[PDB]
Specification:
part of a larger assembly; 4 chains; A mainly beta; B mainly beta; C mainly beta; A: mainly beta; Immunoglobulin-like; 6-stranded antiparallel β-sheet; 50% strand; B: Immunoglobulin-like; 2 domains; 5-stranded mixed β-sheet; 2 helices; elongated; binds a molecule of 10 linked components (NAG-NAG-BMA-MAN-MAN-MAN-MAN-MAN-...); binds a molecule of 3 linked components (NAG-NAG-BMA); binds a molecule of 2 linked components (NAG-NAG); binds 2-acetamido-2-deoxy-beta-D-glucopyranose; Envelope glycoprotein gp160 (chain D); viral protein/immune system; Entry Inhibitors
């Protein structure tokens, strides 16, 4: 009954405040705890901090001097600010619902207990990239097809990750296979997507892909045919 | 941080030992985390697991001090291949900010699968912009290790190749891309290009030609 | 700041070589001297002697006998004030078995009155005379120090292996005692009924006036370690559940308040739990 | 050798350990019975017994 979803910039220049937000779906925000976790390539999971149902802050001392975990009780919205961003801060940032557990081993009167937290429902994640390089829209060229036929599209030269691909604005979902992207020596990723399809289906049944690259806000689309 | 290896056979039972022994009465969490994927909470209390996690996932309760926290995965399948974290809370140690070192489970004995190579030629609109780029798409193979080889006619070419590293699919199989970029003139002057995917002991090749 | 992990430079089996040892110490057995440097509580005024770790202070019945040509006269009026004429007297060669139970405020593992609850003192008209309550209903107390402790032998000199507080295995918890709420409140609303006989006023229980730790507390022994329990939750006269007294533990104690002789009780390893009967009191009246 | 487990005490250099005869006597109202069978096993019935102070 409680979902989550992040929202980020995708790109932040070095030494600058990185801002993300999350939108709770199906529950009161000022009713639970909320945490932020980020995973960088190489380093394991790192717990950034958490905000109580009382909206009281508490950050990881590994970055406590640079984190501000806010909230907007009005619109089920939780935020994060990370000032003084450096190249290491690039990671996949998650927001999750922390649930408080009260572990009691002795007498509750003598305080013989401690407080442990566990994040049981997370967001889908927002990828952030730290590089002073500028943004760049892609270039989606059609891959014409030729038992079963296979057609696709070549999303060329963009920065930075990610890129959203879909077929017929959501109509065609089966047989699709979007491929992971290739970072090029020029410094910009190139992606590819294909869909296996019946050999007769290209009578005129329009197959149109849908490419979204939001870090530049340059959404395009294109149609494939022999 | 630094990761610890672990290999169990498919169908067998995995015993993931925690990284840090507890000093008091504990409350250990277990997070399954695959790379590029949102972690899921397997077990929150020392043994309690939320709705949506199978019974084959088992934790050790803290009934007497001295017991060591271990995660038990009965009947390990290919999907159980991930990183596992031991969030260790206890009475005497302070605030468990760290999830601890990862234990990367790698289930052995998964079935082998063959690539599904497909090579598209440069696009006409691409060729119009004085830029041609072939694309070889390898998918649905296992184990995740392939050797691509680009052959202009018969002689090989290596200047212009960029091969994506194998990555796992939803089928628990691997897929990799490989792009050969070339000027639109050397795309027409050659007889035909080829993409030779070598996986395990077998090679397989899809070739394309300018026409 | 309940207990401490303390390090100290210690003499070894050889007289010139020094060793750096660590040992746990209760906060009560230590004083903060004039950067987290401390000092044993009774080194500024007394000589400390450690109990030979084999002898035990388990109270066993003592039979006090009179020599030949002497006699012991025993009163058996089950209402005897403790003073004056008692009839039905009988002679015995030896007294009954008497356990030397050393406690404060609350009398542990004592005898019971057969009828009523006998108040005893010399002069009840002043105040400085100690009132001694006897009881017929014994309230069962249960005390325990739950910290699973470890004994650690340290080398301090030739043949001199003093035994220190090693390590706390398991949880860090608090020593305490339990008494039943309905039962102690019942038998304390009973002693109240008997004080009205002599003082035709309204009786009251506050707490100990203060001073040294041993007088203010319910000091006693349990398993081999000396407890000190804050009895405020027992004496507050307010005419089911259970009550719990916060107790602490000392290792540097000074029983039989000598000129300057301290006593170190070697730590008893493991889980300590003793259940004892409270069969009396010793109250003091304000002016 | 014995500093790792014991306290060492030096003999007062005047006292001597020269073994001299010790006469063990019993108090008044008691007696000492002596066997004089020159084959006595050390245990059991001995005849010819004599008493000594
Ligand atoms: C002198 O007087 C003194 C004072 O009176 C007295 O001190 C007492 O000492 C004893 C022993 O030292 C203390 O006993 C401990 O009590 C702890 C608390 O126990 C109560 O609470 C739990 C949990 O309650 C939550 O969960 C339940 C359901 O799960 C809910 O119903 C509750 O509402 C509550 O849920 C809310 O809690 C939070 C607050 O709102 C929220 O965060 C949360 O989200 C929820 O909203 C209850 O389950 C207990 O129920 C049991 O007892 C009741 C009787 O009332 C019965 O229903 C039934 O018999 C139940 O069995 C209870 O009410 C215990 O946690 C503790 O036991 C654990 O800890 C010790 C030490 O760590 C372990 O060794 C032990 O084995 C236990 O570990 C189990 O539990 C932990 C925690 O869950 C697990 O992590 C662990 O793996 C293990 O789980 C396994 O076993 C479980 C059962 O054992 C099983 O369920 C699991 O599935 C798994 O297999 C211990 O018993 C007592 O607290 C002291 N007194 C006071 C006042 O504190 C002293 O003894 C006296 N005598 C002397 C000195 O001689
Ligand atoms: C009380 O304080 C003393 C120090 O004054 C503590 O001794 C120290 O304890 C730790 C943990 O036992 C030792 O570190 C450990 O070393 C071992 C071996 O390398 C390793 O297994 C651990 O990962 C950790 O690194 C430390 O060496 C030790 N110091 C000495 C001089 O022995 C003691 O643990 C404290 N105990 C309590 C109950 O407070
Ligand atoms: C008042 O009297 C009671 C009853 O005798 C005392 O309880 C006794 O406490 C002693 C010391 O802790 C117990 O000795 C222990 O025995 C157990 C099992 O036998 C053993 O595991 C321990 O190592 C230790 O020897 C004794 O058992 C216990 N008696 C009973 C009947 O349970 C109590 O201590 C007395 N109170 C005072 C202040 O002296
Ligand atoms: C209390 O501490 C001791 C050790 O500090 C634990 O004693 C163990 O008891 C088991 C019982 O079979 C023995 O096999 C072990 O050898 C003992 N340990 C040692 C070091 O001797 C005891 O379990 C602890 N109690 C707790 C933690 O509740
Ligand atoms: C006088 O004192 C004696 C105790 O010395 C009491 O005698 C005991 O009485 C009980 C009750 O029947 C008997 O079971 C015991 O056998 C008696 N003891 C002896 C040694 O005879 C006696 O009850 C007292 N009398 C009064 C009036 O108090
Ligand atoms: C604690 O109190 C109970 C109740 O008075 C004692 O139980 C009696 O113990 C005496 C010991 O001589 C027995 O002769 C009685 O038969 C017992 N009667 C009842 C009703 O229990 C118990 O012995 C007391 N324990 C201590 C250590 O004082
Ligand atoms: C019985 O025991 C006594 C010793 O107590 C023996 O008596 C001695 O015998 C020798 C041998 O002639 C005498 O010189 C001593 O004077 C005797 N001593 C006394 C005190 O009279 C005696 O020989 C023993 N008899 C037997 C048969 O063994
Ligand atoms: C013991 O003495 C040495 C100097 O020899 C010093 O370095 C050390 O800190 C001392 N330790 C304590 C606990 O006094
Ligand atoms: C001795 O130490 C005690 C610790 O409580 C202190 O209060 C007292 O003043 C000291 N007295 C002397 C004579 O050293
Ligand atoms: C015990 O002494 C009291 C003192 O008032 C007396 O009333 C009672 O009768 C005496 N018991 C006897 C004589 O048995
Ligand atoms: C104690 O009882 C005796 C009985 O003869 C009585 O004379 C005396 O006044 C009483 N004293 C007190 C302090 O109760
Ligand atoms: C104990 O003595 C008191 C004295 O007032 C009395 O009220 C109570 O009934 C007696 N209880 C028993 C069990 O003898
Ligand atoms: C005695 O009884 C009441 C309860 O708090 C109060 O008047 C007073 O503070 C208490 N303590 C004393 C007089 O030391
Ligand atoms: C005793 O406990 C009471 C409350 O239970 C507390 O107010 C008081 O300060 C305590 N005194 C001591 C000496 O521990
Ligand atoms: C003491 O010294 C003797 C010397 O023979 C040695 O064998 C023994 O192990 C030592 N033991 C202790 C407890 O120091
Ligand atoms: C002494 O005892 C032995 C035991 O066999 C016996 O043969 C011998 O005759 C005894 N000597 C006597 C009685 O003089």
């Amino acid at each position: 009954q409680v979902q989550l979803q992040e929202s980020g910039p995708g790109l932040v220049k070095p030494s600058e405040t990185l801002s993300l937000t999350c939108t709770v779906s199906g529950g009161s925000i000022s009713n639970y705890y909320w945490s932020w976790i980020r995973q960088s390539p190489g380093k394991g999971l790192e717990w950034i901090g958490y905000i109580s149902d009382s909206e009281s802050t508490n950050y990881n001392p590994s970055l406590k001097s640079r984190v501000i975990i806010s909230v907007d009780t009005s619109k089920n919205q939780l935020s994060l600010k990370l000032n003084s961003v450096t190249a290491a801060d690039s990671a996949i940032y998650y927001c999750a619902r922390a649930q408080q557990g009260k572990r009691i081993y002795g007498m509750v009167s003598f305080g013989e207990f401690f407080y442990y937290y566990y994040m049981d429902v997370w967001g889908k994640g927002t990828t952030v990239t730290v590089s002073s390089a500028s943004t760049k829209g892609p270039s989606v060229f059609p891959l014409a097809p030729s038992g079963t036929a296979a057609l696709g599209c070549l999303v060329k030269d963009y920065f930075p990750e990610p890129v959203t691909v879909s077929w017929n604005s959501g109509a065609l979902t089966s047989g699709v296979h979007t491929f992971p992207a290739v970072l090029q020596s020029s410094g910009l990723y190139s992606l590819s997507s294909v869909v296996t399809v019946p050999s007769s289906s290209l009578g005129t049944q329009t197959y149109i892909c849908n490419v979204n690259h939001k870090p530049s806000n340059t959404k395009v689309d294109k149609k494939v045919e022999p | 941080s630094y990761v610890r290896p672990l290999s169990v056979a498919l169908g067998e039972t995995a015993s993931i030992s925690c990284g840090r022994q507890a000093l008091g009465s504990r409350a250990v969490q277990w997070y399954q985390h695959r790379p590029g994927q949102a972690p899921i909470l397997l077990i929150y209390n020392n043994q309690d697991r939320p709705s949506g996690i199978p019974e084959r996932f088992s934790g050790t309760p803290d009934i007497n001090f001295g017991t060591r926290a271990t995660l038990t995965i009965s009947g390990v399948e290919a999907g159980d291949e991930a990183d596992y974290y031991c969030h260790m809370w206890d009475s005497r140690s302070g605030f468990s900010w760290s999830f601890g070192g990862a234990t990367r489970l790698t289930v052995l004995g998964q079935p082998k699968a063959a690539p599904s190579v497909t090579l598209f030629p440069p696009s006409s609109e691409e060729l119009q912009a004085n830029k041609a780029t072939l694309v070889c798409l390898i998918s649905d193979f296992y184990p995740g290790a392939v050797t691509v080889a680009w052959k202009a006619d018969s002689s090989p070419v290596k200047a212009g190749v960029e091969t994506t590293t194998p990555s796992k699919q939803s089928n628990n199989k691997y897929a990799a891309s490989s792009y050969l970029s070339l000027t639109p003139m050397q795309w027409k002057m050659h007889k035909s290009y080829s993409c030779q995917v070598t996986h395990e002991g077998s090679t397989v090749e899809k070739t394309v030609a300018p026409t | 700041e309940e207990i401490k992990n303390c390090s100290f430079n210690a003499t070894t089996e050889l007289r010139d070589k020094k060793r750096r040892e660590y040992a746990l110490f209760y906060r009560l057995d230590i004083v903060p001297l004039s950067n987290s440097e401390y000092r044993l509580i009774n080194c500024n005024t007394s000589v400390i002697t450690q109990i030979c770790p084999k002898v035990t202070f388990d109270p066993i019945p003592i039979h006090y006998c009179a020599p030949a040509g002497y006699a012991i006269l025993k009163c058996n009026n089950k209402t005897f004030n403790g003073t004056g004429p008692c009839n039905n007297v009988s002679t015995v060669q030896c007294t009954h078995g008497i356990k030397p139970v050393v406690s404060t405020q609350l009398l542990l593992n004592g005898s019971l009155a057969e009828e009523e609850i006998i108040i005893r003192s010399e002069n009840l008209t002043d105040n400085v005379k100690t009132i001694i309550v006897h009881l017929n209903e014994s309230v069962e107390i249960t005390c325990t120090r739950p910290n699973n402790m470890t004994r650690k032998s340290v080398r301090i000199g030739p043949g001199q292996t003093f035994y220190a507080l090693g390590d706390i295995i398991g949880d860090i918890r608090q020593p305490h005692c339990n008494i039943s709420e309905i039962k102690w409140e019942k038998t304390l609303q009973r002693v109240s009924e008997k004080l009205r006989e002599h003082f035709n006023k309204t009786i009251i229980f506050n707490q100990s006036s203060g001073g040294d730790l041993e007088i203010t507390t319910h000091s006693f022994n349990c398993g081999g370690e000396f407890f000190y329990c804050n009895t405020s939750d027992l004496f507050f006269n307010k005419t089911n559940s259970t009550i719990t007294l916060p107790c602490r533990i000392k290792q540097i104690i000074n029983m039989w308040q000598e000129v300057g002789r301290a006593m170190y009780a070697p730590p008893i390893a493991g889980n300590i739990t003793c259940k004892s009967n409270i069969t009396g009191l010793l109250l003091t009246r304000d002016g």
